[PDB]
């Protein structure tokens, strides 16, 4: 209900747009940047928490277009004298699709964490081993635009 309200508000009244550029991927516990990118809309809410709606493109194992689009949210902390430093933890609820399965929309739910300074943020997820080519951390820079 509040989740439905929140997504919409980002949809209807975004405050910024963002560019997402993949940065690094590594295997959880150690078991060129990754191809792709995305863009999105976002806002900081009155709790100072982050809401985003994004669309990204990657390349799958067959070198085929692999989209993901979704909503991201992070509970955000600004613990230092310079309020521009921000750390966050939340999740993303999204949809992806694969050439092998005729691009049928499939639900994805993943964790999110980030550390940034003002409009420049290192943000990441853990892709669980339940997914093909999973059990990896995947991180990107997010660049926030508009004042
Ligand atoms: C912030 C982390 C930036 C990525 C550095 C990874 C290079 C180590 C190999
Ligand atoms: C390969 C090494 C990967 C280390 C990534 C460091 C991320 C620190 C935040
Ligand atoms: C299902 C969620 C899809 C939401 C994706 C929204 C992305 C639109 C961002 C357009 C940004 C406009 N631009 C390029 C001038 O920044
Ligand atoms: C708020 C943005 C959330 C973006 C979540 C990205 C999840 C997909 C991770 C990329 C996977 C691409 N690849 C080729 C490694 O499978
Ligand atoms: C990207 C590196 C990992 C960052 C992990 C940061 C997690 C700190 C928790 C931030 C939220 C704090 N709190 C309780 C006010 O929400």
């Amino acid at each position: 209900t509040t989740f439905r309200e929140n997504i919409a508000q980002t949809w209807q009244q975004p405050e910024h747009y963002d560019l997402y550029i993949p940065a690094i991927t590594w295997h959880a516990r150690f078991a060129e940047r990754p191809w792709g990118g995305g863009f999105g809309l976002s806002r900081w809410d009155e709790k100072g928490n982050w809401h985003g709606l994004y669309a990204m493109a990657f390349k799958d194992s067959w070198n085929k277009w692999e989209p993901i689009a979704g909503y991201g949210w992070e509970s955000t902390w600004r613990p230092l004298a310079d309020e521009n430093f921000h750390l966050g933890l939340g999740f993303t609820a999204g949809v992806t699709a694969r050439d092998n399965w005729n691009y049928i929309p499939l639900p994805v739910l993943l964790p999110l964490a980030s550390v940034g300074y003002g409009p420049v943020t290192f943000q990441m997820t853990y892709i669980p081993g339940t997914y093909n080519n999973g059990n990896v951390y995947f991180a990107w820079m997010r660049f926030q635009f508009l004042e």
Side-chain angles (χ1 to χ4, degrees):
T1 284
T2 299
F3 179 65
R4 293 198 175 130
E5 291 183 349
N6 282 341
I7 285 170
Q9 168 155 354
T10 311
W11 192 280
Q12 288 192 109
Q13 307 162 326
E15 288 173 345
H16 300 285
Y17 71 86
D18 297 281
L19 169 66
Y20 296 77
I21 301 296
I24 181 164
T25 179
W26 69 105
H27 275 252
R29 302 212 154 235
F30 302 123
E32 200 169 327
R33 70 137 139 81
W35 194 93
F39 46 89
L41 305 165
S42 61
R43 60 183 185 89
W44 294 99
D45 57 29
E46 72 285 336
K47 278 167 74 80
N49 293 337
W50 185 76
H51 301 259
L53 288 163
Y54 62 88
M56 297 166 143
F58 302 105
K59 220 185 247 208
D60 67 14
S61 303
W62 270 271
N63 289 327
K64 293 282 190 240
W65 168 67
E66 163 184 281
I68 180 158
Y71 164 77
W73 174 78
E74 295 194 0
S75 181
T76 302
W77 192 33
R78 305 176 170 79
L80 313 180
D82 192 335
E83 81 270 10
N84 288 287
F85 290 97
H86 54 263
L87 299 95
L89 198 182
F91 67 92
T92 174
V95 182
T96 189
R98 301 146 160 217
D99 185 69
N100 302 299
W101 297 342
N102 302 348
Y103 286 109
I104 180 104
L106 324 140
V108 181
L109 190 287
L110 304 164
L112 289 178
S114 75
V115 181
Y117 184 91
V120 177
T121 296
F122 178 94
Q123 184 174 37
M124 65 178 282
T125 184
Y126 165 70
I127 303 305
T130 47
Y131 294 112
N132 181 67
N133 302 323
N135 195 29
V136 294
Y137 292 112
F138 190 92
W140 52 91
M141 298 301 300
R142 185 185 79 241
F143 303 97
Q144 179 193 98
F145 295 92
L146 311 172
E147 269 104 59

